[PDB]
Amino acid sequence: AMNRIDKTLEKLKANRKKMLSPYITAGDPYPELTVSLMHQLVKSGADVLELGIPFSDEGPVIQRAMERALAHSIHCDDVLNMVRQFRKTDTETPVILMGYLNPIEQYGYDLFAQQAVEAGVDGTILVDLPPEEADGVSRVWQKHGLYSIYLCSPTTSAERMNYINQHANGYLYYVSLALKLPELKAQYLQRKAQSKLPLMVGFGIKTPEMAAQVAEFADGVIVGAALINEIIEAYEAKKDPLQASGALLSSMRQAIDNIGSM
């Protein structure tokens, strides 16, 4: 009874590699491109995919991405269908759905949980679900074997970390909301020492160089918006966003893997 996330994290650990996880919004810039983007990212070195559920509610880059997607009336079922299409040729790469609690609740907690797993979703990141309100979701998610990726920060309380260290599976999403790299490193390592699960840095990764500098000490890096910009700028410039996003992620994949060399 193993989740794709745990299997992937094990192979990474055995290969002495760090996780590289890209985020894109489902349906951005148009629906017919999402699955193609998912494959391209995996091809360019993505270990885990984060797929955003569009919702109107957070940085301006992600906000505009969700607005673009919502113009195509992209909803939960559409996101799940894209995962199914993806799973027709990719059954290995873990897929994480990222989004807000409201669309899932309107869909129905239990109905969404089983549909997500059936579609091939391995876990969720609920950005507006604090641990104090996650009891109900945690129980339903556990029934269908859906992982809950919890967030934590430099200020995450001791009681929260206790709750997180028990109910969280897979990995933790590290956030920290004029921050420089040395200060980040110190704060990250402090939090990592208090976490059972591996701690993935999920902000501020814009370039291959930065990705490599963070991966020096971090368990993994999450690309939060850099790929969104790369895709939409290539699209606006009448260029190919598949090549653009791939080239950016490949550059990060290579920079991360080149750690330890001379």
- Residue 23 has φ and ψ, to the nearest 5°, of -115, 135
Considering 10, 32, 58, 67, which one is annotated as catalytic?
58
Q: What is the C-alpha separation between 165 and 138, in angstroms, rounded?
A: 13
Tokens of 53: 């559920």
Direct distance between the N- and C-terminal alpha carbons of the chain, in angstroms, rounded to an integer: 41
Q: How many other C-beta atoms can be found within 10 angstroms of the C-beta atom of residue 154?
A: 15
- Cβ neighbors of 12 (< 8 A, separation 6 or more) are 18, 19, 47, 220
Considering 10, 32, 50, 92, which one is annotated as catalytic?
50
Tokens of 101: 């609690």
The residue to which tokens 């090549």 are assigned: 243
- Cβ neighbors of 22 (< 8 A, separation 6 or more) are 41, 46, 49, 50, 222, 223, 227, 245, 249
Instruction: Please say if 50 is a catalytic residue.
Output: yes
β-strands 19-25, 220-223: how paired? parallel
Q: What is the C-alpha separation between 41 and 75, in angstroms, rounded?
A: 22
Q: Are 84 and 34 in contact (CB under 8 A)?
A: no
DSSP state of 32: G
Let me know if 32 is exposed, middle or buried by CB neighbors in 10 A (0-12, 13-18, 19+): exposed
Query: What are the catalytic residues?
Result: 50, 58
